[PDB]
Design a protein around this motif. Structure first.
Motif, mmCIF file in Angstrom:
data_model
loop_
_atom_site.group_PDB
_atom_site.id
_atom_site.type_symbol
_atom_site.label_atom_id
_atom_site.label_comp_id
_atom_site.label_asym_id
_atom_site.label_seq_id
_atom_site.Cartn_x
_atom_site.Cartn_y
_atom_site.Cartn_z
ATOM 1 N N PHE E 642 0.839 -1.241 0.107
ATOM 2 C CA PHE E 642 0.064 -0.223 -0.016
ATOM 3 C C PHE E 642 0.862 1.138 -0.157
ATOM 4 O O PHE E 642 0.276 2.497 -0.065
ATOM 5 C CB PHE E 642 -0.888 -0.079 1.054
ATOM 6 N N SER E 643 2.217 1.084 -0.075
ATOM 7 C CA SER E 643 2.987 2.302 -0.211
ATOM 8 C C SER E 643 2.857 2.680 -1.592
ATOM 9 O O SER E 643 2.697 3.892 -2.047
ATOM 10 C CB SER E 643 4.429 2.175 0.145
ATOM 11 N N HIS E 644 2.832 1.784 -2.612
ATOM 12 C CA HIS E 644 2.360 2.107 -4.055
ATOM 13 C C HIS E 644 0.970 1.816 -4.093
ATOM 14 O O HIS E 644 0.637 0.876 -4.602
ATOM 15 C CB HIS E 644 3.376 1.022 -5.001
ATOM 16 N N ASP E 645 0.161 2.844 -3.744
ATOM 17 C CA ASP E 645 -1.079 2.956 -3.574
ATOM 18 C C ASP E 645 -1.919 4.026 -4.424
ATOM 19 O O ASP E 645 -1.274 5.216 -4.231
ATOM 20 C CB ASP E 645 -1.757 2.618 -2.494
ATOM 21 N N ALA E 646 -3.061 3.808 -5.201
ATOM 22 C CA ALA E 646 -3.562 5.158 -5.852
ATOM 23 C C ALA E 646 -3.961 6.296 -4.690
ATOM 24 O O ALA E 646 -3.724 7.331 -5.021
ATOM 25 C CB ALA E 646 -4.806 4.549 -6.644
ATOM 26 N N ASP E 647 -4.377 6.038 -3.604
ATOM 27 C CA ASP E 647 -5.054 6.891 -2.824
ATOM 28 C C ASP E 647 -3.761 7.369 -1.919
ATOM 29 O O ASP E 647 -3.103 6.730 -1.233
ATOM 30 C CB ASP E 647 -5.746 6.009 -1.473
ATOM 31 N N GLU E 649 -3.424 9.534 0.579
ATOM 32 C CA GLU E 649 -3.322 9.318 1.875
ATOM 33 C C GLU E 649 -2.902 7.877 2.604
ATOM 34 O O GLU E 649 -2.105 7.868 3.334
ATOM 35 C CB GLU E 649 -4.641 9.798 2.646
ATOM 36 N N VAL E 650 -3.516 6.785 1.739
ATOM 37 C CA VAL E 650 -3.061 5.640 1.978
ATOM 38 C C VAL E 650 -1.624 5.340 1.688
ATOM 39 O O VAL E 650 -0.826 4.652 2.569
ATOM 40 C CB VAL E 650 -3.921 4.667 1.430
ATOM 41 N N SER E 651 -0.994 6.190 0.767
ATOM 42 C CA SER E 651 0.256 5.900 0.506
ATOM 43 C C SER E 651 1.080 6.649 1.630
ATOM 44 O O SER E 651 2.330 5.921 2.168
ATOM 45 C CB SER E 651 0.718 6.349 -0.933
ATOM 46 N N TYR E 652 0.693 7.692 1.930
ATOM 47 C CA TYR E 652 1.489 8.405 3.129
ATOM 48 C C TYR E 652 1.670 7.559 4.411
ATOM 49 O O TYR E 652 2.560 7.384 5.109
ATOM 50 C CB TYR E 652 1.018 9.938 3.435
ATOM 51 N N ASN E 653 0.291 7.330 4.982
ATOM 52 C CA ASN E 653 0.130 6.461 6.028
ATOM 53 C C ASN E 653 0.815 5.189 6.055
ATOM 54 O O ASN E 653 1.534 4.819 6.907
ATOM 55 C CB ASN E 653 -1.169 6.260 6.197
ATOM 56 N N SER E 654 1.010 4.459 5.113
ATOM 57 C CA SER E 654 1.740 3.146 4.714
ATOM 58 C C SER E 654 3.094 3.572 4.839
ATOM 59 O O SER E 654 3.924 2.516 5.549
ATOM 60 C CB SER E 654 1.312 2.457 3.569
ATOM 61 N N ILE E 655 3.772 4.633 4.237
ATOM 62 C CA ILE E 655 5.147 4.625 4.412
ATOM 63 C C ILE E 655 5.542 5.057 5.750
ATOM 64 O O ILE E 655 6.354 4.424 6.194
ATOM 65 C CB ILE E 655 5.589 5.790 3.437
ATOM 66 N N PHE E 656 4.734 5.888 6.588
ATOM 67 C CA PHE E 656 5.175 6.232 7.712
ATOM 68 C C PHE E 656 4.937 5.047 8.865
ATOM 69 O O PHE E 656 5.651 4.892 9.732
ATOM 70 C CB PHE E 656 4.245 7.235 8.262
ATOM 71 N N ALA E 657 4.093 4.193 8.550
ATOM 72 C CA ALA E 657 3.748 3.017 9.275
ATOM 73 C C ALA E 657 4.831 1.984 9.267
ATOM 74 O O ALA E 657 5.311 1.371 9.940
ATOM 75 C CB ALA E 657 2.243 2.427 8.876
ATOM 76 N N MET E 658 5.244 2.007 7.801
ATOM 77 C CA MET E 658 6.589 1.253 7.910
ATOM 78 C C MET E 658 7.884 1.682 8.454
ATOM 79 O O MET E 658 8.487 1.002 9.081
ATOM 80 C CB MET E 658 6.906 1.123 6.142
ATOM 81 N N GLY E 659 7.849 2.948 8.492
ATOM 82 C CA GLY E 659 8.906 3.323 9.313
ATOM 83 C C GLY E 659 8.772 3.190 10.903
ATOM 84 O O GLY E 659 9.601 2.932 11.429
ATOM 85 N N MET E 660 7.459 3.491 11.417
ATOM 86 C CA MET E 660 7.195 3.083 12.755
ATOM 87 C C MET E 660 7.482 1.721 13.128
ATOM 88 O O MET E 660 8.148 1.380 13.906
ATOM 89 C CB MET E 660 5.568 3.260 13.076
ATOM 90 N N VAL E 661 7.149 0.597 11.944
ATOM 91 C CA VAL E 661 7.507 -0.883 12.361
ATOM 92 C C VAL E 661 8.917 -0.769 12.522
ATOM 93 O O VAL E 661 9.426 -1.638 13.300
ATOM 94 C CB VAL E 661 6.803 -1.585 11.230
ATOM 95 N N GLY E 662 9.590 -0.120 11.563
ATOM 96 C CA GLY E 662 10.955 -0.483 11.483
ATOM 97 C C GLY E 662 11.983 0.624 12.534
ATOM 98 O O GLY E 662 13.060 0.434 12.689
ATOM 99 N N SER E 663 11.233 1.253 13.241
ATOM 100 C CA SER E 663 11.811 2.261 14.156
ATOM 101 C C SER E 663 13.003 1.613 15.153
ATOM 102 O O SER E 663 12.808 0.666 15.611
ATOM 103 C CB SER E 663 10.718 2.797 15.037
ATOM 104 N N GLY E 664 14.073 2.335 14.859
ATOM 105 C CA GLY E 664 15.049 1.775 15.842
ATOM 106 C C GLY E 664 15.632 0.359 15.629
ATOM 107 O O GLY E 664 15.936 -0.349 16.791
ATOM 108 N N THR E 665 15.640 0.036 14.375
ATOM 109 C CA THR E 665 16.120 -1.444 14.064
ATOM 110 C C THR E 665 17.205 -1.518 13.032
ATOM 111 O O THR E 665 18.073 -2.705 13.023
ATOM 112 C CB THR E 665 14.848 -2.069 13.517
ATOM 113 N N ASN E 666 17.525 -0.628 12.214
ATOM 114 C CA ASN E 666 18.669 -0.503 11.242
ATOM 115 C C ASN E 666 18.519 -1.739 10.301
ATOM 116 O O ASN E 666 19.456 -2.304 9.541
ATOM 117 C CB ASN E 666 20.055 -0.565 11.657
#
Ligand SMILES: Nc1ncnc2c1ncn2[C@@H]1O[C@H](COP(=O)(O)OP(=O)(O)OP(=O)(O)O)[C@@H](O)[C@H]1O
Ligand SMILES: Nc1ncnc2c1ncn2[C@@H]1O[C@H](COP(=O)(O)OP(=O)(O)OP(=O)(O)O)[C@@H](O)[C@H]1O
Ligand SMILES: [Mg+2]
Ligand SMILES: [Mg+2]
Lengths: 393, 146, 390, 152, 836, 51
Positions: E642-647, E649-666
């Motif tokens: 959903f990072s590559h999504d038509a919507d 807003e969904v794209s933005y939220n998906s990218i940030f959620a990916m960042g959050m899931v990976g927070s502090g992991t390298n």
């Protein structure tokens, strides 16, 4: 289906009821949600036309290649039929759990991107080795073993049937079983019976089949036999007549003895070595156990060692009844007279006696087997003794 | 050695050996490429390969004597901090029937024994312990010898 | 019904059946029918229906695998050998720097001008790449009882030089790079090998001797060379040859050729271990039952410097092994493992593990949930005594 | 036949695939089916042991070298479909051909036919048969003595 | 049948239906004794129904009859016992229990476990069915249960004993006979069962476990259970009672980690040091010591994370013209995240004014706050560096400096109250930007403190006239963070009055969403105690009323795993914009048990498959909350889809959620995915901004920081961390207007959840002490016989290790005995007297 | 073309640009088994195979 790993006590317990009730509640929620949403809108059209886009992406003339190596970044080296290799991209609609070196992949015609994988034949060695249901018979035929049957069941059947008993005590089941006894006592019979009564892929190999004529093929055969035994879920590998491949391992030997020793070493490593053996159970039979290798039958390799004795007095009657069950007999058969002699008779000998008696009745055209027919058949069977009288006695 | 045997596989290595023989000496003499060869066994080598036009100088490398052993131990102990007490002559006398590899093992094992003991510099006792370790001698659980 | 396994057994069974039925209903409602063309689930036709497959097929071209053979002049000019297609003299792409490409490595090339675009990993035999451990065993040195001096020597051969390299460079010592483990069957050689594999912070390559035996002439040597090249690739990497006696038989060439191919494989192994070229940071284990059959060249120092001997444990070691193997068992509070160790004469850890398992199974047979000292005594009588002929 | 895992092929060789299918058919078809199978072999030893298993072709009948009467009968059988002249004494031919096997009895007929061809008559003669035996048996003895010398 | 001599000898009693009835005494005792011995004799098979029982099965009516009402001395007793054991197979009424109550009183061990279990089940059933009115009839059942329990404990059926006592609800009986060996297993089983049980029993289970732990003097475990129970009086009692100063120091570390402060009496021993540990004054020193030990001190500029040169520079010339100001803001955020807590930075430290003025408008505010983010936990050094910017010609820069001071003070406590001292001046200032900076700084500095002075200072801002909706919402957020888990009457009354005072048109603003969030944060974790708040809110306009109702409900039931509440939320999902808050609250509630977390992952997948844009724009933010700092491959694939999504807003939220899931992991795979996404959205400014933020989050700290609320074996929950996560995510609910707009300082709420991943082990005098530990994935060992291993896939390192999510640590050698069993955070180690 | 006629081991014709099955070309069955029946096998009897 990729469901939660309960990993609660794993024994029937209130914690395991609660974790399981929770899974059921969540699944009920999902089912209700999906049902209601489907009723509101079918979404079948939406599900379709994604397949149309996929079919557009993967052109009509899909070519069959051979995956060679995955660079682990949605890229791969795939070899076409001619022999050339290309560095392509693994697209997102291909089930990556199926990709492995040597698989038959479907390649795009123009861009050669991996766009699918094909199923492969199911006979590396499985069709040749697997025995299916044992044609001989179920446990009914075996007579007078009893305790040996119980030991075999505790070895191979019980772990698959009730594993909670083992998991409670924390002990893993005994590794393997070796069936030893004089020739003609029922080792192969019991193996076949457990094979037909079990729910696991049963494989049978005779040791004489591991003496290959080309260097390294015996070791390769054992390696592949155990290779397609982890690929088939629970399995039982029964290496009948181990004595051919296993032996005292005297270093001072020349010829094919060295190759047989190398095959035995590979089998040793497979039975117990660096790697965990997974869920595979090994049975072995040997008329001659005293000549085997202590390394081959050491405890950690083979835990259980079952002795098969010659039938004594009543097991003999049982085998006679079992083998004469489907055979019309005249009312003068002194089976007790047949068995009373202490002639070290074996079960195979009894079977031969019955078959030969029937055959000679057929030869004489009679409609029923007679006591004299049985006696003459027994005399003929026991004529195959040989040896020297005074020698050794 | 070439032998008249029905087993294949050996004939391919024999063909490679014949090519090597021709390259070493044959038609079109070579005068710009020398050759050095090392072998543990010379009883199995083919006569055509041990000839005088191909392998002319056959140099024998014997097991070291006492002086050779002493020199080897000194060479391999050059870099280590060794005390001025070690009697390399005694070590050579006590390391009979050794090779250069075994002497190197003696030295490295002496160093490791010193490390185990927690010592900055080696000692004659450490060297003797290393000799014992390298000898790989097993005990028969009894010593009834006088 | 049954005799009663648990008050909750029927509830567990019912909930499991309901879970299976609900899973079936969800699968039917959502579709997800199996595909013979290897298509992922529709929920994972993700970026595949579009939006990354499109943007991966548009900008990402198709490169073709080739092998560089020569580099001509300082100016970049590379000879490549596209497999089964052709050979070309080709130039680099702007993305790849000249230092990245060396002679003999695999490079992908575009289909139009055949210029290099990306270096690729070396081609390696599947049968040698599968020797790498990948996932390491869970055994540790604490699970090996009765071997203290042996484990100390094994560590200082394989573990300490890697963990604390400066400790040896400071004192100018070159630690031994090879060790041989020999002893009666069941003593713990492979167990110590597993412990080393678990503890090591480096490549561990597991090699079984029988694998190096091959049908075609000159195959074991090629596998050994490829294995050692793969090892050299790594910063430091441990190779473990279990059952080395399979291919390490003593040279006995005489008359008709006997095991000449296996002897050639052995000679290649010897050359790699010690030879003209310098061996990398490769530490080598070897476990065998018959050290006598090994050749002098292989048993020479510089190839197998340390020779650790494994023997039957003493009374204290037997007690420790009993404790280790009864750790994860349901046993009574007070069992005299010392008494059991004495009651079992000279015997191996394999025998002790068999005794523990058989005690557990005697309990399971008598329909108990706690193994007793009586069960352990019966297990000893069954294993040590009845099978004493083996 | 020979064996199912013989050259390391894993049973994938065509020779073993054929054996697998033959065994499959043999197991499939029932005993009370009036479809019997007779397999013959001059080399019993190299025969695959999977065919002699109970539930398959297990019964076995042996064949010694033919005696005088058997040799005469085989000569008659193989000379039935040939133009033979009056008073052809195949019994005397059999007597003049002692210790001959099926292959020799088959070959003597063809040689007699060829000799009749050379003489250019449409019928074989007793003299033609005599010369045919003199040729075939002598060449068989020559092959036997050549094998003996090779062994020497 | 073959061995039917057993049948014959069983008949020898069966046909003699009245063998005991016959007047001869030779058949009275011996016959019944032989029958009992035969039935009690075991077999050689584990198949079913021992042969004696299978044979005596039919002889049931006559067995009953021979008992009837004969002599009560011994005959009736033995007959009743045999009836009871035989009653197992018939499986009808409770005859086994009946006859055991009236029969022979022998030891159940003589009858075996398969019978004790049946009798225990029957006892539980009879106790449950029986009403309290019949007290005197419970006494026999009580003595039976007393007999059963130690048998299970001795025969290694601790789970069975706990199950029986929990079924009959008499769980307090355990402590009297728990014994010192089975206490660990029993406590573990009870603490594991606590999660999946309703409210009236979860507290009781926890209290019983705490009782056992206190009995055996496992003070750290007792304090963990007290913190979970949220019983501050219990916490104080345990901490004060502990008479070992080293153990009290360990408990002070745990309390400081959890954000709980105990006002200790000055007379207590080592009081100042025990209050220094709780205040996390030394946290920065320890963090910098770890950084030096691991050699990660060198600052990293955003270019190192971006790695533009690796990407195929197809547009290296006249490429897409992206918003340079937005990209500079992204760079500032990335620098702050990457250099967080280290104190050194290569952009602001060397020449900060240039970098700040490189940004535009509010970007200056965010960039200035980034300095405090970098100087986190360094109150002493924070001011000496932020002073230069505290007096600036730009209101944005001054507000950013205020927020930076607040951030620097966040997570640590001083007696100087620098945050209050500096930020109390600009609370009511006439510049709304400075108001915002000061309010947010104070909230972040005193999150989870419950400081009455700060609360009374802040509260009037909400009602003040010259306060924009932004300032009102930010003040509500700050008050909620300060009073998280406090149910403050003042805060709740003020928020309710503010919500009621506004009009429908004003409530249509998205910034107003921060007031219900404030109330929810105030009431976080207090289920069933928000009925009053819902009733009060029932008088607001329909759309905002629904939004606030759902948000308050989910926040109140946060971290409970209430299946009923999840069911209600799913009904809400299956209208207005409260559906997004419902989706977020599903994860908020299921954020605990792993079972719930994964089942919620399944539900979220189905939600994305079938759902409306509103619901789909919120599923990605639910995934981040459910798995924050846990880079699961399945979740990452779902987010990448959903990072590559038509919507957009969904794209933005998906990218940030990916960042959050990976927070502090390298995570290397995540970094590669994010670089690929930068290439994909090379020409999309908002998406590229989100990608840069995600990369910064992925490299948060340098692998030395985490945003996971939970800790202490993923069992304790951090109120402040959950508050920060909810702040950021609820703000993202309308990402276009807040984050990609004039209010992106809200991203600094993550500072509340920022905590270290270290494992630093000290000696008994608070001094580093390297020790070898095994770090590997945790293994659940509940109800497993023996002492099974507790980790898998482990490796050995030296003490200062970084623990990833789901990584347990276990000391390699027995040289040191840890004070606390949970090897995590700071652990004091003591020498083991019996080492050799 | 109906798939039911696309049987295993049958020759087909695929177009040039895109391989698209558009015909089922004739196949050579090659029956090698209908040529070894010997009917009742007359004139093969025990009497004349005497011995
Ligand atoms: N107890 C028995 N009950 C029934 N049949 C038996 C018994 N013992 C032997 N037989 C017969 O013996 C025949 C020979 O096969 P069996 O499995 O008995 O051999 P075996 O003991 O494995 O011998 P070998 O050691 O030579 O492999 C079987 O067909 C079975 O009919
Ligand atoms: N000292 C020991 N401590 C604990 N377990 C031991 C010990 N020695 C042997 N074992 C047990 O023996 C089992 C057999 O494996 P082990 O490593 O001992 O075989 P091995 O000596 O390498 O055998 P082989 O000679 O057949 O190659 C191991 O799984 C371990 O359970
Ligand atoms: Mg057999
Ligand atoms: Mg081994």
């Amino acid at each position: 289906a990729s469901k939660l790993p309960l990993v609660t006590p794993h024994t029937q317990c209130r914690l395991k009821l609660l974790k399981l009730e929770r899974i059921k509640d969540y699944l009920l929620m999902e089912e209700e949600f999906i049902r209601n949403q489907e009723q509101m809108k079918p979404l079948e059209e939406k599900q379709e036309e994604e397949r149309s886009k996929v079919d557009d992406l993967r052109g009509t003339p899909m070519s069959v290649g051979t995956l060679e190596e995955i660079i682990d970044d949605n890229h791969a080296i795939v070899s076409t039929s001619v022999g050339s290799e290309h560095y392509v991209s693994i697209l997102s609609f291909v089930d990556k759990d199926l990709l492995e070196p040597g698989c038959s992949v479907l390649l795009n015609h123009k861009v050669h991107a991996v766009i699918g994988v094909l199923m492969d034949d199911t006979d590396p060695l499985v069709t040749v080795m697997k025995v299916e249901k044992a044609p001989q018979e179920t446990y009914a035929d075996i007579g007078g073993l009893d305790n040996q049957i119980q030991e075999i069941k505790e070895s191979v059947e019980l772990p698959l049937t009730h594993p909670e008993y083992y998991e409670e005590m924390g002990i893993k089941p005994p590794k393997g079983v070796i069936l030893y006894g004089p020739p003609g006592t029922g080792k192969t019979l019991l193996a076949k019976a457990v094979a037909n009564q079990t729910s696991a892929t049963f494989l049978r190999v005779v040791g004489s089949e591991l003496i290959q004529k080309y260097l390294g093929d015996g070791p390769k055969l054992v390696r592949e036999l155990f290779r397609v035994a982890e690929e088939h879920a629970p399995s039982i590998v029964f290496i009948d007549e181990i004595d051919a491949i296993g032996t005292k391992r005297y270093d001072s030997n020349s010829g094919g003895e060295r190759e047989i020793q190398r095959t035995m070493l590979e089998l040793l490593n497979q039975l117990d070595g660096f790697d965990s053996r997974g869920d595979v159970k090994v049975i072995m039979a040997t008329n001659r156990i005293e000549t085997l290798d202590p390394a081959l039958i050491r405890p950690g390799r083979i835990d259980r060692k079952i002795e098969f004795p010659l039938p004594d007095e009543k097991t003999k009657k049982r085998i006679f009844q079992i083998h004469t069950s489907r055979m019309t007999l005249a009312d003068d058969v002194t089976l007790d007279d047949l068995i009373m002699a202490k002639d070290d008779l074996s079960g195979a000998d009894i079977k031969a006696i019955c078959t030969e008696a029937g055959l000679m009745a057929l030869r004489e055209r009679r409609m029923k087997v007679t006591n004299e027919d049985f006696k003459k058949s027994k005399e003929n069977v026991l004529y195959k003794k040989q040896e020297g009288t005074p020698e050794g006695l | 050695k070439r032998f008249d045997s029905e087993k294949a596989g050996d004939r391919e290595v024999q063909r490679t050996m014949l090519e090597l023989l021709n390259q070493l000496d044959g038609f079109q003499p070579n005068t710009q490429v020398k050759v050095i060869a090392a072998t543990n066994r010379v009883d199995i080598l083919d006569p055509a390969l041990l000839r005088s036009g191909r392998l002319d100088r056959k140099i024998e490398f014997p097991m070291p004597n006492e002086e050779a052993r002493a020199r080897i131990m000194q060479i391999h102990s050059r870099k280590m901090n060794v005390s001025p007490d070690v009697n390399y002559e005694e070590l050579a006398r006590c390391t009979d029937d050794f090779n250069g590899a075994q002497c190197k093992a003696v030295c490295v094992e002496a160093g490791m024994i010193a490390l185990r003991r927690g010592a900055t510099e080696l000692t004659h006792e450490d060297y003797m312990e290393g000799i014992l370790e390298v000898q790989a001698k097993k005990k028969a659980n009894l010593q009834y010898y006088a | 019904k049954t005799y009663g396994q648990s008050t909750y057994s029927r509830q567990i069974k019912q909930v499991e059946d309901d879970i299976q039925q609900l899973l079936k209903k969800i699968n039917e409602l959502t579709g997800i029918k199996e595909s013979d063309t290897g298509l992922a689930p529709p929920a994972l036709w993700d970026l595949a229906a579009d939006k990354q497959t499109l943007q991966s097929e548009q900008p990402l071209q198709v490169a073709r695998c080739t092998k560089i053979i020569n580099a001509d002049s300082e100016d970049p000019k590379y000879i490549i050998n596209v497999k089964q297609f052709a050979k070309f003299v080709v130039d680099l792409s702007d993305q790849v720097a000249p230092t990245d490409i060396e002679e003999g490595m695999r490079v992908g090339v575009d289909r139009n001008k055949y210029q290099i675009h990306i270096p690729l990993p070396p081609k390696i035999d599947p049968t040698v790449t599968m020797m790498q451990v990948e996932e390491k065993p869970d055994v540790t040195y604490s699970d090996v009882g009765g071997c203290k001096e042996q484990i100390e020597k094994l560590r200082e051969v394989v573990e300490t030089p890697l963990l604390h390299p400066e400790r040896f460079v400071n004192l100018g010592i070159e630690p031994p790079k090879g060790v041989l483990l020999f002893g009666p069957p069941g003593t713990g050689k492979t167990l110590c090998a597993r412990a080393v594999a678990n503890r090591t912070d480096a490549c561990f390559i597991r090699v079984i001797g029988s694998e190096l035996v091959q049908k075609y002439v000159g195959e074991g040597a090629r596998m050994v060379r490829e294995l050692f090249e793969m090892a050299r690739t790594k910063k430091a990497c441990l190779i473990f040859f279990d059952e080395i006696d399979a291919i390490g038989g003593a040279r006995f060439d005489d008359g008709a050729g006997g095991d000449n191919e296996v002897q050639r494989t052995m000679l290649e192994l010897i050359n790699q271990l010690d030879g003209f070229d310098p061996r990398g940071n490769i530490k080598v284990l070897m476990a065998t039952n018959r050290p006598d059959t090994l050749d002098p060249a292989l048993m020479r120092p510089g190839r197998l410097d340390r020779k650790i001997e494994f023997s039957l444990p003493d009374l204290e070691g037997r007690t420790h092994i009993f404790k280790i193997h009864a750790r994860s068992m349901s046993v009574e509070r007070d069992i005299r493992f010392e008494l059991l160790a004495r009651l079992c004469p000279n015997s191996t850890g394999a025998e002790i593990r068999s005794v523990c398992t058989e005690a557990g199974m005697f309990a399971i047979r008598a329909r108990r949930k706690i193994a007793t000292e009586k069960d352990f005594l019966e297990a000893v009588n069954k294993v040590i005594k009845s099978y004493a002929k083996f | 036949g020979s064996s199912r895992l013989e050259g390391g092929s894993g049973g994938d060789s065509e020779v073993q695939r054929t054996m697998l299918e033959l065994l499959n058919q043999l197991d499939g078809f029932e005993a009370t089916k009036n479809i019997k199978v007779i397999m013959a072999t001059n080399r019993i030893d190299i025969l695959d042991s999977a065919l002699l298993r109970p539930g398959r072709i297990d019964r076995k009948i042996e064949f010694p070298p033919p005696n005088e009467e058997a040799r005469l009968d085989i000569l008659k059988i193989h000379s039935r479909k040939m133009n033979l002249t009056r008073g052809i004494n195949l019994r005397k031919i059999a007597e003049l051909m002692p210790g001959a096997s099926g292959a020799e009895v088959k070959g003597v007929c063809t040689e007699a036919g060829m000799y009749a061809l050379r003489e250019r008559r449409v019928h074989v003669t007793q003299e033609d048969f005599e010369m045919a035996v003199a040729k075939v048996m002598q060449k068989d003895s020559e092959k036997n003595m050549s094998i003996k010398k090779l062994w020497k | 049948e073959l061995s039917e001599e057993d049948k014959q000898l069983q008949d020898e009693l069966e046909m003699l239906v009245e063998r005991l009835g016959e007047k001869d005494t030779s058949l009275y005792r011996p016959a019944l004794e032989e029958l009992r011995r035969q039935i009690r004799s075991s077999t050689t098979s584990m198949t079913s129904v021992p042969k004696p029982l299978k044979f005596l099965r039919p002889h049931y009516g006559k067995l009953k009859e021979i008992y009837e009402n004969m002599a009560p001395g011994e005959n009736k007793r033995f007959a009743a016992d045999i009836i009871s054991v035989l009653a197992m197979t018939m499986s009808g009424e409770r005859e086994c229990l009946k006859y055991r109550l009236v029969g022979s009183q022998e030891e159940l061990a003589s009858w075996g476990h398969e019978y004790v279990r049946h009798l225990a089940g029957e006892v539980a059933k009879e106790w449950q069915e029986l009403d309290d009115a019949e007290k005197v009839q419970r006494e026999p059942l009580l003595t039976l249960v007393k007999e059963i329990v130690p048998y299970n404990m001795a025969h290694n059926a601790e789970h069975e004993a706990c199950d029986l006592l929990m079924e009959i609800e008499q769980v307090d009986m355990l402590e009297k006979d728990i014994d010192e060996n089975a206490y660990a297993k029993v406590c573990l089983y009870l603490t594991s069962c606590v999660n999946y049980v309703p409210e009236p029993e979860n507290s009781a289970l926890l209290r019983c476990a705490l009782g056992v732990f206190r009995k055996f003097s496992r003070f750290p475990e007792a304090l963990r259970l007290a913190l979970m129970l949220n019983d501050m009086e219990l916490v104080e009692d345990i901490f004060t009672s502990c008479k070992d100063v080293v153990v009290q120091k360990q408990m002070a570390f745990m309390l400081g980690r959890h954000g709980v402060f105990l006002e200790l009496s000055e007379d207590v021993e080592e009081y100042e040091d025990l209050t220094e540990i709780m205040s996390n004054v030394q946290l920065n020193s320890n963090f910098l010591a770890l950084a030096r030990e691991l050699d990660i001190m060198e600052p990293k500029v955003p270019d190192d994370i971006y790695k533009t040169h690796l990407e195929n520079n197809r547009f290296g010339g006249s490429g897409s013209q992206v918003d340079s100001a937005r990209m500079n803001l992204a760079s500032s955020f990335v620098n702050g995240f990457v250099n967080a807590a280290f104190g050194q930075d290569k952009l602001l430290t060397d020449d900060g004014n240039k970098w700040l003025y490189k940004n535009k408008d509010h970007g200056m505010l965010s960039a200035a706050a980034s300095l405090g983010m970098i100087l986190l936990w360094d109150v002493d050094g924070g001011l000496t560096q932020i002073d230069k910017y505290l007096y600036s010609s730009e209101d944005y820069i001054k507000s950013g400096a205020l927020l930076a001071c607040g951030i620097v003070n966040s997570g640590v406590r001083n007696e100087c109250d620098p945050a209050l001292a500096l930020l109390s001046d600009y609370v009511l200032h006439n510049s709304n930007t400075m108001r915002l900076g000061s309010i947010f700084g104070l909230g972040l500095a005193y999150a989870g403190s419950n400081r009455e002075d700060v609360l009374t200072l802040l509260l009037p801002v909400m009602g003040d006239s010259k306060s924009s909706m932004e300032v009102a919402g930010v003040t509500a957020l700050a008050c909620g963070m300060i009073a998280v888990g406090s149910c403050n009457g003042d805060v709740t009354s003020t928020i309710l009055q503010t919500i009621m005072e506004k009009s429908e048109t004003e409530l249509k603003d998205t910034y107003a969403r921060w007031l219900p969030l404030g109330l929810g944060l105030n009431h976080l974790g207090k289920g069933e105690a928000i009925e009053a708040i819902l009733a009060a809110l029932e008088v607001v306009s329909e759309p905002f009323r629904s939004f606030a109702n759902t948000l308050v409900d989910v926040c109140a039931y946060a971290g409970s795993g209430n299946v009923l509440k999840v069911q209600q939320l799913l009904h809400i999902c299956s209208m207005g914009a409260h559906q997004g808050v419902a989706v977020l609250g599903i994860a908020l509630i299921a954020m605990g048990e792993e079972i719930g977390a994964e089942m919620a992952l399944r539900t979220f997948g189905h939600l994305l498959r079938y759902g409306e844009p509103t619901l789909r724009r919120a599923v990605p933010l639910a995934l981040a909350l459910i798995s924050v700092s846990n880079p699961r491959l399945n979740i990452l694939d779902t987010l990448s889809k959903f990072s590559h999504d038509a919507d957009p807003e969904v794209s933005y939220n998906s990218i940030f959620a990916m960042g959050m899931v990976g927070s502090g992991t390298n995570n290397a795979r995540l970094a590669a995915m994010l670089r690929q996404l930068a290439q994909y959205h090379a020409k999309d400014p908002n998406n590229l901004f989100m990608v840069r933020l995600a990369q910064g989050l992925t490299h948060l700290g340098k692998g030395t920081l985490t945003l996971c609320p939970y800790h202490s074996d993923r069992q304790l929950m951090s109120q402040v961390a959950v508050a920060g996560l909810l702040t950021v995510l609820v703000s993202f609910l309308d990402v276009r207007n807040i984050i990609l707009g004039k209010s992106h300082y809200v991203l600094y709420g993550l500072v509340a959840a920022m905590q270290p991943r270290m494992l630093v082990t000290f000696d008994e005098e608070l001094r580093p002490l390297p020790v070898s530990v095994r770090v590997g994935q945790a293994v659940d060992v509940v109800g497993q016989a023996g002492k099974p291993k507790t980790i898998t896939g482990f490796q050995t390192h030296t003490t200062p290790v970084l623990l990833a999510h789901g990584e347990r640590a276990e000391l390699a050698t027995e040289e040191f005995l840890p004070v606390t069993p949970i090897l995590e955070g700071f652990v004091i180690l003591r020498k083991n007297p019996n080492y050799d | 073309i109906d798939i039911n006629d696309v049987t295993p081991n049958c020759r087909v014709a695929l177009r040039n640009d895109s391989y698209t099955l558009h015909k089922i070309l004739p196949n050579k069955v090659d029956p090698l088994v209908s040529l070894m029946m010997v009917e009742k096998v007359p004139d093969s009897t025990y009497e004349m195979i005497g011995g």
